[PDB]
């Protein structure tokens, strides 16, 4: 597509307006539109894409969890299939949104990404969207988990080789990969180890950052530490 | 529970 | 409709689940479904309807205001028609939602409402949805404003005759009618007067309420007073 | 600006 007749620059402009208006579904459709124009995305453009879909999927995941626990509490009076039906409805929409993002990545963001920064970005996105599928998978599950692991690992290899330890996407990648280990892959020890090594390596590289870079890196470093406080 | 990377972007 | 094949009681049950999951668009479709079954709504059922649509329209109104002020700030560098296009898109959706509610009221909630409590409820809802149309109307506007005034006034006449001054819907009706006077009809003096008389009459009737009724009435009385503090 | 009646319902 419905965005096929709007100018690329117009879609981007409207995505920024949808962001300011907190209209993330709109924002997500504009950015999908923008991607399907077939030109590679700038740094700013990637951020808008990611913000849009994370907000849409964040609302869905939160609804799922509410409903999924109402459902588990009902298997411990017979109420009917309504809870399950609605939980499946929400689940199905969630899966459609992950499938949309994973389709954009496969057609053709990942293969056209030649620079480390863009390539890491997209492989991290791939990891995160398989991780969200994995959170709801029951049947399938093992394949989805391996697809997540595989994307995250590839991104980690590139980021280790090509980016300084304080790079915010490197830190955010590692934070998300360690949440994968802990919550999805049943590997607390791997989660803790990764979070610790990532924090320590960033700490020892801070002296190279300007004041602005310093602010950015330390914000996500704090989230690694918050997690470590919970896990240890 | 653990926090993943938010918004920030 | 898409809800035509689901049981009335199932739609209600799922509306309560959508409420808990903060899925207000879903909630709104379930309740529309429930209304179109053609049976009158209970007190609880009316509340769910109202909560669902107020949440949907509240998000839209807030987006509109953000965008409408970006638009006014751009008439004071030439950016293109994107701001206007998107503001019209949001506006159009808003109008579709008000038109949906006003259609449910006309077919056939209002005419089947014989008791004061249900009748006041629906006429207040009618007032509020014309008021929201009026907020965006430019061309039309005078007719919309009179439709709002007319619904609110009819509700006030019934509530004055049929309900005690501390009844929460009577108080909420008056609060909303006075916001109408102040923000829509350009009548600050009418807004202040109505808020004052409504507060005073409730105050002098509190001694009849139980502890629970007392809590409910005083909560919206506080909102009248907040408004009066701003306006005077 | 003035508040109308919220949620509460
Ligand atoms: C994905 C995550 C939030 C990230 O790396 O953000 C960079 C600031
Ligand atoms: C419409 C308004 C919020 C109302 O009367 O609520 C009753 C508690
Ligand atoms: Cl949205
Ligand atoms: Cl359903
Ligand atoms: Cl891969
Ligand atoms: Cl919603
Ligand atoms: Cl548009
Ligand atoms: Cl009327
Ligand atoms: Mg029992
Ligand atoms: Mg200039």
Author numbering:
A (entry chain A), C (entry chain A): -4 to 71, 75 to 137, 139 to 231
B (entry chain P), D (entry chain P): 86 to 94
What does the paper say about this structure?
Here we report protein-based thio-methacrylate esters—electrophiles that can be installed easily on unprotected peptides and proteins via cysteine side chains, and react efficiently and selectively with cysteine and lysine side chains on the target. Methacrylate phosphopeptides derived from 14-3-3-binding proteins irreversibly label 14-3-3σ via either lysine or cysteine residues, depending on the position of the electrophile. Our primary objective was to design binders that would target conserved lysines in the phoshopeptide binding groove of 14-3-3σ: lysines 49 and 122. Methacrylate peptides targeting a conserved lysine residue exhibit pan-isoform binding of 14-3-3 proteins both in lysates and in extracellular media.
Significant covalent labeling of 14-3-3σ with the expected adduct mass was observed for the peptides 3 (51%), 8 (35%), and 11 (57%), all of which were predicted to bind Lys122. We analyzed these peptides further using time course labeling experiments at lower peptide concentrations (5 µM) at 25 °C. Peptides 3 and 8 reached 60% and 80% labeling within 5 h, respectively. In contrast, peptides containing or following Lys122 were significantly depleted by peptides 3 and 8, albeit not uniformly, while the signals of Lys49 containing peptides were slightly increased. This result pointed to Lys122 as the likely binding site for peptides 3 and 8. To further confirm that Lysine 122 is the target residue for peptides 3 and 8, we co-crystallized 14-3-3σ with both peptides. The crystal structures clearly showed the covalent bond formed between the amine of Lys122 with the methacrylate, with Lys49 remaining unmodified. Comparison of the crystal structure with the prediction from CovPepDock indicated the model correctly predicts the binding pose around the phosphate and the N-terminal part of the peptide, but less so for the C-terminal region. More specifically, compared to the prediction, Lys122 adopts a more relaxed conformation, the C-terminal residues are not as tightly packed in the binding groove, and in peptide 8 the C-terminal glutamine could not be modeled due to insufficient density. For peptide 8, the C terminal part of the peptide is displaced outwards due to the space occupied by the methacrylate ester moiety. While peptide 12 labeled only the sigma isoform, peptides 3 and 8 labeled all isoforms with similar efficiencies, Taken together these results conclusively validate that peptides 3 and 8 specifically bind to Lys122 via aza-Michael addition.
